[PDB]
Design a protein around this ligand. Structure first.
Ligand SMILES: [Zn+2]
Ligand SMILES: [Zn+2]
Lengths: 129, 382, 53, 383
């Protein structure tokens, strides 16, 4: 039964973290095409004909990269949180699978009695009203 | 003159693709109004999450507006009221009960954590949107964190503490000759309308349910006063208006006034409580009908700012705000909800579209014809 | 009362309209596709900086 | 009607486009003999490589050597017992391995020869290193002519193929790609890769084979997949003596539709040499230029592609088409002269870079082609 619970839990945390990642992608998505264009223009064979042009293109690339590190480090942070939370969730999931498969115990039997009381209390909450 | 026009599916206008600056802050969604309160800033976070998970960030430049200061708020409000607002806390209200009864805070304007921070961030969002729209750096400012129009010069009512709309209007008026204001909220923009009665610079049009409703003001005879005569139009309606009826009662008025008034800048409130299944609303609009107004206003190629107010059922206001944000970029939406944090809150079908209710419409065509007759008659004077 | 836990006789297919919703949910596949699309989007840039290094 | 015969246009390549290709060759690949009377002959890789050396193609292409695949890497597909027996078996001790050989389907039609593990590891390493270099983005094309043996099952070595390195290459491509399109040209149906990837969506195991009385006995129009892999098994069964023009008219629409709908990120293009005229067992009549037009069309898109070898029961024609395809991969057309090499005396009495079609009964009626194209389009629109 815990397998069902962890299956419910997976998408919620995954989606929260993915929304965070989408926000980080959003705040820096307008510089990736500029960086790629600068790199491609730098790697052109007909570019080295003016030293000042090389200097200014290198300066532009350096400025873009200086602006781009913060997004990358925030991405590492959120991905690390992703990894640890998902590790915990998978741990719960595969303990649940191993327990459910090892025997095709009185403690988990008691939890049924504890929940049976709640089901009995909620069923009688409509009769008594 | 009112004529029946059946509603048609919305298609974007590829003539213009103006820049969109969607102002947003991540701390607005933390504030809460109470336990049983209907007004929730959490809907702004819902809409932002829907936008983020939908793939709309590649087109629009997302910002984070700096909170406004007290001196900026004093451009329209009184020093005493803003001082009380800053000083009041959810703990020392007993010592501030005199101002609370005097400034009408506590009944529909509950004091909560970071209330002054909420007002400051909304005012700053509107201020920065107006600043961007004034410097030519942008043409559309989606300040979804604002939309607070019920607040007055020295009073706070209708969950509305700081009137950011009039502050943004003043910023536009810094260098613009004439500005125009639109409303779509079911209630009436009492504060924004009142702020510019005697002057020609600002016009305040509101499509507000009239009669025994919350604002209780804004009849057809609210022509103006002094030199601001005929420069504040009102379109009172009744319960149960639909998409086609709203379009037919909305578009001709705007066309006529911008023919006559000739605005140099535009602001558009986008109240989300005028939809089907709303908690505090009495309309039957859908997301297509809601987005029709913003698409129509944008189609005229004028500098416009979209603010966000109202909305008391999460799914409806979130979907409507997402649709409006998408259509402001001249992009039709997928109309399928991607999985996110709040996927469980989006109905039992998990579809972006929300079906409008079947409830009986009340607006008779002849009443609407007479209403727009008076509107056009008073607008023809100038 | 549909909250009642499944019995050990494998009533998984004939379930209470809720277990089937999760075991039939294809959301995991969509999550995998989104993750791998992000992986490709990042790997293109990774190759770019590898060349520039 | 979907099929439409068109005249065969001349070969044209974009001069503006630049393509990086990393040819893979292990000099020890062509030194293992299946037997005295066995159609399989690994010498073709060596002869083709000699041709590419002599034609001067080395000045415009990159070539490396792929490290042999480890046993654990090779076990990414096949069972542990299968690989264990394949390593432990020798042509001299099969008396104690008779039961294992009977179980594993080896010895009678696929016999045990010394160096079998070395050959299998060489092919697997070539495929895996090609896929790894494809993922890293350094080379757009990773040519591995050594492998391509797609008839190996998970626990059985049928059709003279003991290890299926195509599966491992696709796996190592899938480690960084969501969807990779696999194209088959071998006359026999690609039973191994098809069975491996029959229940998955992340691959597009497109095929162009022949249906009739054969050893595979698979590749029907009905088989489209199970589970999430439904309608993701494109098969185009054909018949005797399909010529160049109709083969091109069948290939180009289908591949265009796949690239327009499936939209893969990498292509694992099989280039089996047993789909040519004069083959030992292949019934087709495709010429070398027809065999290379498919590769040129696949290359014209501009996406990373992993070209592999495979079947081919003749040597001269297979080597000629392989070197022609390698040249075409560089946007360079190879002249018809076959410059002198150590194995020059092999190349027939014509001594020209060309394989010429024979006169065979073209059983491939246009009605069959129209029907199969309609079925393929119907099952492909679901993607
Ligand atoms: Zn309202
Ligand atoms: Zn073959």
């Amino acid at each position: 039964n815990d397998i069902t619970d962890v299956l419910e839990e997976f998408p919620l945390a995954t989606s929260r973290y993915l929304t965070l990642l989408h926000e980080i992608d959003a705040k820096c998505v307008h510089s990736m095409p500029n960086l790629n264009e600068r790199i491609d223009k730098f790697l052109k064979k007909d570019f080295n004909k003016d030293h000042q042009t090389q200097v200014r293109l290198l300066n532009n690339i350096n400025k873009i990269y200086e602006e781009l590190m913060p997004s990358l480090e925030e991405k590492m942070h959120v991905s690390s949180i992703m990894l640890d939370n998902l590790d915990r969730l998978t741990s719960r999931l595969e303990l649940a699978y191993e327990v459910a498969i090892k025997n095709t115990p009185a403690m988990h039997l008691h939890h049924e009695l504890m929940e049976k009381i709640e089901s009995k209390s909620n069923s009688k909450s409509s009769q008594a009203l | 003159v009112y004529e029946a026009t059946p509603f048609d599916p919305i298609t974007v206008k590829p003539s213009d693709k103006r820049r969109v600056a969607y102002f947003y802050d991540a701390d607005v969604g933390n504030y809460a109004y109470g336990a049983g309160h209907p007004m929730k800033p959490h809907r702004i976070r819902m809409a932002h999450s829907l936008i983020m998970n939908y793939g709309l960030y590649k087109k629009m430049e997302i910002y984070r507006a700096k909170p406004a200061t007290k001196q900026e708020m004093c451009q329209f409000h009184t020093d005493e009221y803003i001082d009380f607002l800053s000083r009041v806390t959810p703990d020392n209200l007993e010592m501030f009960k005199r101002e609370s009864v005097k400034f009408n805070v506590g009944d529909d304007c509950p004091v909560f954590d970071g209330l002054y921070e909420y007002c400051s961030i909304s005012g700053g969002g509107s201020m920065e949107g107006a600043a961007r729209l004034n410097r030519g750096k942008c043409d559309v400012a989606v300040n979804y964190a604002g939309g607070l129009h019920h607040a007055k010069k020295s009073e706070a009512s209708g969950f509305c503490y700081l009137n950011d709309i009039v502050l943004g209007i003043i910023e536009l008026l810094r260098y613009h000759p004439r500005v125009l204001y639109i409303d779509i909220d079911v209630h009436h923009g009492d504060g924004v309308e009142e702020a510019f009665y005697t002057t020609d610079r600002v016009m305040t049009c509101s499509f507000h349910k009239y009669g025994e409703f919350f604002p209780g003001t804004g009849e057809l005879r609210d022509i103006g006063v002094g030199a601001g005569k005929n420069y504040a139009v009102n379109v009172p309606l009744r319960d149960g208006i639909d998409d086609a009826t709203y379009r037919s009662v909305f578009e001709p008025v705007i066309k006529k006034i911008m023919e006559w008034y000739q605005p140099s800048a535009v602001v558009l409130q986008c109240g989300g409580d005028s939809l089907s299944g709303d908690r505090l609303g009495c309309f039957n609009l859908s997301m297509e009908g809601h987005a029709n107004c913003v698409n129509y206003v944008k189609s005229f190629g004028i500098p416009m700012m979209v603010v966000g107010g109202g909305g008391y059922t999460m799914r409806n206001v979130a979907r409507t705000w997402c649709f409006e944000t998408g259509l402001l970029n001249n992009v039709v939406l997928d109309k399928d909800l991607p999985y996110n944090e709040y996927y469980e809150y989006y109905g039992p079908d998990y579809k972006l579209s929300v079906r409008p209710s079947n409830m009986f419409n009340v607006n008779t065509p002849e009443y609407l014809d007479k209403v727009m007759t008076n509107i056009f008659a008073n607008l023809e004077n100038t | 009362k549909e909250i009642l836990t499944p019995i050990l006789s494998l009533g998984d297919i004939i379930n209470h309209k809720t277990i089937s919703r999760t075991f039939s949910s294809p959301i995991l596949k969509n999550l995998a596709l989104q993750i791998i699309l992000m992986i490709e989007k990042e790997q293109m840039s990774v190759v770019r900086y590898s060349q520039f290094l």
